[PDB]
Design a protein around this ligand. Structure first.
Ligand SMILES: O=C(O)CCCCCNC(=O)CCCC[C@@H]1SC[C@@H]2NC(=O)N[C@@H]21
Ligand SMILES: O=C(O)CCCCCNC(=O)CCCC[C@@H]1SC[C@@H]2NC(=O)N[C@@H]21
Ligand SMILES: O=C(O)CCCCCNC(=O)CCCC[C@@H]1SC[C@@H]2NC(=O)N[C@@H]21
Ligand SMILES: O=C(O)CCCCCNC(=O)CCCC[C@@H]1SC[C@@H]2NC(=O)N[C@@H]21
Lengths: 119, 118, 119, 118
């Protein structure tokens, strides 16, 4: 159910393929920030979820560098997939920028994104 | 400089290989929590950091399931690599557990880990 | 505009009074967790906001101990007030529990709450 | 044990008084960021921690505005006090800046600070 095209509240696009071994691979296109075009993403997910009523834990990373731009930063999203008629991935994320050692204290942003599956 | 064996402050070991295009691949062994043996890890890093003096942005994920246990959770570390004599990777992490909807508010833990090659 | 009664998506209630010196004082009643009745809250807010189109930065803390229960934990909410016809306080929070030194790594939860002002 | 003068790893000084019912009052002086002089701080702490061996839960807020500057932001630290010979306060913090709606996604920074009386 994870595999497919998803969009978040900002208009960003997340295209992912879930592998049988727990691997997530795909491309991400961000509606905001210092980004252009597609960026490679790689992640992991729990391929043997609990079967009560719980979500599937997962996470993925994107380094903001492709052939067109490099923002010297990486974002990791951690959250869970909640399947159903209306599938959603609720996340919390951390965006770290490469900084000198003096600005290190302000290298990391934190937010939350909710993704909606197309079709 | 990233490629290698790293250890954090809790006793975990992180073995990673950094590929030429920004890929991070390896295995993780946790010292705490519901965990036993190695777990596969994957991530990405800036394979062209700035030349000022800044660290190298990176991140990776470890889903806590292997052929022995499944804690139904995944951790993502976000931080930066800083080279030099005493190379370090400073990160902050988010641990999300699969939960029912009524427990989603307390699904995520947050912490910080410092990795060194010592 | 901050002063008043607010509710979040979980059904929790936040009654606050904003002082002229940047102080926030009031009571909080949580719909979830190890809590019962009212808990004292104290915080600070930027009493001289930018006047472009931006929110007002603020934060407050609640220690989960009152005369009825003690959860040995404290939550701090950090966010901004966005006034208007439909006033909202968008937050991110950290809940830390007192732990032994060995469980310290798992002492802190992180989430996000959106509050809606009544009337 | 909480009452006193504390310092973090960046050079900031935290002067607090802990009241009998759980109130935290004091002043903060930052060593980094847009900041100059002391800022008022208020918080709460568990005024009846458990007797096992656990730390004391606490939190406080500092709005970054005083009679000299206004960074239009507020930081909240959440963590715990651990007594003993080398008393420490370990925390994680969230720094939110007032933003326009189109910049709300990047309104909040997150970090961790360790305070000692040294
Ligand atoms: O590098 C700094 O110091 C930060 C500068 C401000 C933002 C610049 N942009 C970037 O670094 C890359 C864009 C990241 C986009 C973010 S990741 C979390 C959030 N979700 C989403 O779909 N888009 C945003
Ligand atoms: O504390 C508990 O066990 C209940 C809370 C839910 C978490 C359950 N999941 C786990 O314990 C999975 C293993 C995570 C261990 C973490 S990842 C962040 C930190 N760094 C490290 O090297 N080990 C710990
Ligand atoms: O103490 C632990 O180890 C955690 C145990 C699980 C939760 C127990 N509950 C508590 O500690 C106190 C309840 C806090 C309520 C939280 S604060 C953040 C969130 N917002 C809101 O309106 N309610 C919840
Ligand atoms: O890096 C910048 O200045 C742009 C990012 C927005 C933040 C603007 N606000 C400030 O700098 C206000 C002062 C915060 C300083 C922080 S609070 C967390 C950390 N601990 C400490 O003792 N000082 C720093």
């Amino acid at each position: 159910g994870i595999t497919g095209t998803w969009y978040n509240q900002l208009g960003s696009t997340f295209i992912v393929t879930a592998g049988a071994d727990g691997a997530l691979t795909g491309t991400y296109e961000s509606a905001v920030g210092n980004a252009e075009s597609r960026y490679v993403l790689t992640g992991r997910y729990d391929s043997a979820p609990a079967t009560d009523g719980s979500g599937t834990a997962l996470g993925w990373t994107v380094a903001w560098k492709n052939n067109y731009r490099n923002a010297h930063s990486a974002t990791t999203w951690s959250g869970q997939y909640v399947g159903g008629a209306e599938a959603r991935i609720n996340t919390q994320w951390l965006l770290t920028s490469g900084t000198t050692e003096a600005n290190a204290w302000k290298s990391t942003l934190v937010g939350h994104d909710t993704f909606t599956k197309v079709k």
